[PDB]
RNA sequence: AAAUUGAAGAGUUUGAUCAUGGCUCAGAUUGAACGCUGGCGGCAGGCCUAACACAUGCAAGUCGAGCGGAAAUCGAGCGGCGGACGGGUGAGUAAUGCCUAGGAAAUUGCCCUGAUGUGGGGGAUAACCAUUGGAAACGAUGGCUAAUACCGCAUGAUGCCUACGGGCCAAAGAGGGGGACCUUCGGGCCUCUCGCGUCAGGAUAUGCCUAGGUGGGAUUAGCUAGUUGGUGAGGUAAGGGCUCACCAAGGCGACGAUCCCUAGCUGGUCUGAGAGGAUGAUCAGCCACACUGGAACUGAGACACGGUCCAGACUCCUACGGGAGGCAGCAGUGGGGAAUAUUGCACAAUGGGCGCAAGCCUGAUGCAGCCAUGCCGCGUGUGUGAAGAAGGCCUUCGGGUUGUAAAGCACUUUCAGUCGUGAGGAAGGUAGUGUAGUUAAUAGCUGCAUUAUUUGACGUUAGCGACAGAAGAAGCACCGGCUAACUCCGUGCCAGCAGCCGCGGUAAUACGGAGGGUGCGAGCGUUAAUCGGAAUUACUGGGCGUAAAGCGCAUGCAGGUGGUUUGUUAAGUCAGAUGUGAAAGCCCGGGGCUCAACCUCGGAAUAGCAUUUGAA
């Protein structure tokens, strides 16, 4: 980079990149979580995982790492998802 | 540019007096008026419809002392304008400054007129105006700065310009040497030698 | 032609052509003179007329006609040509530019100078 | 309410009708007025329609790929 | 964002302004909203110095349009001209 | 009121003719080039080629009122915001773009409006210090530390999910001033300012969809298999084969699919009586691209000209381990080319970024330089002047002509020159003061005035005066016909000319010179190129017995067209309304520059499209 400012950006670029990886990663995990249990089929254990991601996805909503829509998407499927089982 | 050669030849060519001079000598006292310019002055014969009308074009060209591209644009103007073409196009080149401080006296040719123009001389409406083409409107009065009052060459043309027949369109005080551009001239008003229609007609061609 | 033939298929464009190929749209074009000779018109005319086949920039050789008495162009001259036909020549499409990079001047012309590249008489 | 009207021309597509539509055009050069054809895949939910059906269709969101546009109503079935 | 601002005309030596809205992303010039009066910084005779539809100006300034420093005085000066 | 007033032909086929029919010419135009020539000004324009390669400088920063600091009110650092704009280019793109008109399934930083909040905690980290790797680039390791950096917890509904019934989600302070109450005298505390969260509207911007329109080729007729549709899942801001699995066999195409060639599109521009034709510089809108190819990251927004990563070609540095770079930003260089400019000045103005502001930054932009590249204006003198000078040229040797031309004699002095004067572009900034709001407040803050003071790159500015003197300022093409303008010499089918027809082989108005003339004029010619003329692709507006042209004849699908009549419908048609058809341009009226070009106000126009109401 030719600019001390684009030289920065890069640097905060670099450190969003990884922090966002890192929430995105565990927001992520705990889905699969949900879904795991979805798929397995046990209308318990699917319930207490989305209990768990639905807060997750709400913070990543507004934290900005997600839109609000992904969050209702995902909500809103998982908890369709489980009253079918 | 201005054409700044010998003018009589233009007045041989164009077979008629231009009044590239004062009329104070007869034209044809100062040159061969009746041969064109030139060897083969004496022998004159058959000219295309093209050269008559091409003839005419700077019979009134020369008159009013306009180069072509200028002359081009009058015409352009000229068929704009609502009406006769022909006649607004000499409405235009008689609405000149160069042209009303000649109709006027102040310059004994137009070409003098233009001079006087050029190196101020000249107030329209009370402002120098040193454009010889800016086109005097109707009710607009031409007059002589006080400095150039005094120019004798101005005295002699009101005198020359008295020897001629008076414009019905301008009025004059000579005294306080300013005019008044009552109103535009009709055709009927400028020389009916001129013939507009072929002028006209040069420019579809 | 009827409406109804013409709306199947419309009244065709003419394809025109060029006559200065070569020139490929550019008002002159610089060469190099691979051979300055002589050639005889097309007959009702007798003449030897002074040509060069030039090595135009864009890679098209072409025959070039040389005009006004004389010239200085050997073979290897770097020549401007412009677009004219001469008439009696079959094949010459294009005029050398007289007066521009190696051709010089028709010597001693004084009327119609500019298109034969002399400069104007020190009076 | 901007529908259009036209004819089914296909009905092999599930729940998918292609519908001619047909417009009368003066030609841009040669003045005269001309039969020019729109088809336009329409979404036929209960495979109502038939090849040859006059139906009545409007414009509505993405269906499919070709799909934009779903039938209002059938206005003559075909013989 | 929306500002109303002047985007030059006229000739070298002799700007005349329009007075626009526009988005501000655009070149002063270029893309604009609405053209919302004008501004002759040398007008002489008849012609109009200042022309300004001030409902308009405040038609816009009431979506959250800014207004340049200069329109801002304009704007002044078309009051004062009411 | 007006928004127009518009339409020319000629040459050449023959012994001659009339037709046919090419070819050619007169016009207008230009981002031109070239030749000759060249004074000034105004306003525009200026790599059309090599999307070739690029030396050098510069084109994106800013904020100390976020933060620890301190190298010298500020470097470096963290953090915020900007860097997605502005600027460039047209390579790709023939329709995934553009134009027009709609549509539904979206988001949208900054801004505006409204409503709500903004509690209480935590762990880090750069800078820094210490040590160490490297030739450098760039690192490493160990301590240290702050925040409007980051994280949890609390809290939140008019948010989101939920069939309920419920469940779930965020945030940040900083600065100015100060009465009283407090004060461990830091501050709490009040008020205002600038910020912070969420939500809802608005505005703006953008994504997505549809229809119609938008080159050439049929000596390119089949093309497609995530292909076309369905179901479900995933995915997205959002609909959707967007993706995958599965089911079906669809889809497109002679109203030209597919393929190939060419090409950024539009407003417009040029030409044209018009209908058309041609075109897409400058200006403005849209699109695409950024050494080539790929990729995402960050972010409201990029798959990012002056960011990241990878691969590649190239160039460079290297201590051989490893590094560096991307002018299609502005100047500029080389190269290519017929051909296209300064390594300028300034942020004064208009904007843009950041900032409470002051400001800082800004090759945007304003200006300046260069070039007759174009348009427009002006000048290069005016009048008088016959011996009709001389000289040149011609001559019937009488004369004619150059030519009132010159000289001479009176004048004038624009513009150049010199010296002076001298607008306008400037809005603002700062500091007082007062006021009027806010507020506990004669504070602070914000506005309004008012005083003082400061802000112009252009710039020795335009504009004006004053001087002195015609003084400093004219070419270029042509003169056989077309086509305005003719003679004499030289030449002798040579030399040469030429757009076409042709000209030249001894009295050449055609070659070359001269005299004279014609046209145009700071230009004039040539070449290239477009339209015109060309009714010569004919819709307007042509033809086919013999000039080019009726298929050898027929049958016939698609298509085109179709008797009479009633009713109906209203698709075509017609009329009107509404929306739209950007601005600029063009046109008509004005207005402003001494005129003009130019600038500018209003109108007309945008012949269309959508919706709608009528007529039949």
Redesign the interface.
Known sequence: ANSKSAKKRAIQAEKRRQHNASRRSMMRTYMKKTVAAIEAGDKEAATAAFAVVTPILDRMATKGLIHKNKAARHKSRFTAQIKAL | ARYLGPKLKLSRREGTDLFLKSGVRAIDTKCKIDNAPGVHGARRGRLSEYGVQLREKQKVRRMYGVLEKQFRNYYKEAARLKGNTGENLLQLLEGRLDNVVYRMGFGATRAEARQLVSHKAILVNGKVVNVPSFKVAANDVVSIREKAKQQSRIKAALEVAEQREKPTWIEVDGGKMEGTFKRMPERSDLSADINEQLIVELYSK | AT??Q??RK?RAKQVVKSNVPALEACPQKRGVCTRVYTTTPKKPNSALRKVCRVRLTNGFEVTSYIGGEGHNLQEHSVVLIRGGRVKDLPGVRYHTVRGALDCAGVNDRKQGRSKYGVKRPKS | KRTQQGRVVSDKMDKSITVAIERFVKHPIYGKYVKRTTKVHAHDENNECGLGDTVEIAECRPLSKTKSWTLVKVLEKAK | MVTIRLARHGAKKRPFYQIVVADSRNAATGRFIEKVGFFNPTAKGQEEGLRLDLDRVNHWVGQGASVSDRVAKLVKDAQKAA
Request: aromatic residues 0%.
């Open positions: 409406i109804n013409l709306v419309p």
